[PDB]
Design a protein around this ligand. Structure first.
Ligand SMILES: [Zn+2]
Lengths: 222, 222
């Protein structure tokens, strides 16, 4: 395989690691054990259809971390869920929720430190709260005022929005409604959402809501 | 991880290999390098959600071959597709079609010999034709009399049928309708179909026809 190797700038500073990501292309140098040597961690994300790349990377010492499915739904606005835009006072509780809900991610041990995944997703949801009109965390509340669920959303382009994080036991359907509402308000035609291949509950929920598969991928690390 | 190691008798005789499959169970002996060592190939299939088993098997030197998504469709009275039950005289044409269309299964190179996948699936489609009223291959013909698409089906139990093989360019929708009609006719509520994680075209078509995800898995070999 031929591939460039690029430092993961944000993750390196955030995790305190010396990691890089491989980008497979015809025009890059040969990917060799020597090119891979000066890194504490190397990541690669390949199309699940590309078995040629899977075995080239495995032969270089990479291992499967997880599969990813990316899906898309037409928008299609719907029942106002009553969700509200998260405010700065919600950050402590959302960080606590997100670090727990997304504890088992591609940043799991033994690839990263035990606290890495929790930190990463807590930062993600905080970043969405401190976002912009086009990057927000929306919250559904119970009648008590407690957070029942949350969904983070971002504009991708003129037609598309993407769900970042979505979590809330028993609130999947209303969180999807919330996301569809948000995309529609911004004139988007398409809503995208990726999940882990192992997350059959999320896959089922998304497909029930009208989603279909756009792409599938493997994350591999060395 | 505790698992029994069970010889793959049928595959050993068909491919001319000496392989086994792992059966993970709380009751079984410890799965060790010593126990795995003498087999030319060892297979393992684990739920994609089970990262503990993934880590354990990678720590015994297993690699990813492919991801599988198993889906299920509700069965109802769909229209007739015009498909016909394949005959013994259709075998030669079906074997050739199947060997070409299913060359890149989990029986692909480098894990098996280059001809192995096509041999396996040609035998599969042949076996379908030679089956009962509860195992058939159904075909669609173009104007020329040529096979345009095919689908093999079997009854699983009182409520379920399963699609074995399905192929035919531009005949996807019709073949699904064919399979649903077959299942309906036999009093089934549920039609199951597995596909490779990388086969986004099949995933999209199954989901368009009403499928949702039932399970996801990795095939790992050593
Ligand atoms: Zn390896």
């Amino acid at each position: 395989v031929r591939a460039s190797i690029e430092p993961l700038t944000w993750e390196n500073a955030f995790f305190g690691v010396n990691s890089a990501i491989v980008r497979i292309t015809s025009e890059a140098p040969l990917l060799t054990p020597d090119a891979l040597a000066p890194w504490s961690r190397v990541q690669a994300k390949i199309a699940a259809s590309n078995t040629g790349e899977l075995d080239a990377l495995q032969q270089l010492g990479f291992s499967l971390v997880e599969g990813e499915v990316d899906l898309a739904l037409p928008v299609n606005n719907v029942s106002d869920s009553g969700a509200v835009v998260a405010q700065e006072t919600d950050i402590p509780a959302l960080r606590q929720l997100a670090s727990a809900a997304f504890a088992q991610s591609r940043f799991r041990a033994p690839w990263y430190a035990p606290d890495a995944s929790g930190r990463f997703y807590a930062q993600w949801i905080e970043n969405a709260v401190r976002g912009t009109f086009d990057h927000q965390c929306l919250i559904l509340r119970a009648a008590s005022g407690d957070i029942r669920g949350y969904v983070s959303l971002r504009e991708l382009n003129a037609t598309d929005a993407r769900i970042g994080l979505l979590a809330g036991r028993g609130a999947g359907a209303e969180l999807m409604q919330t996301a569809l509402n948000w995309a529609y308000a911004r004139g988007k035609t398409t809503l995208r959402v990726a999940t882990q291949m192992g997350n059959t509950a999320a896959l089922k929920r998304y497909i029930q809501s009208g989603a279909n598969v756009e792409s599938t991928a493997y994350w591999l690390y060395r």
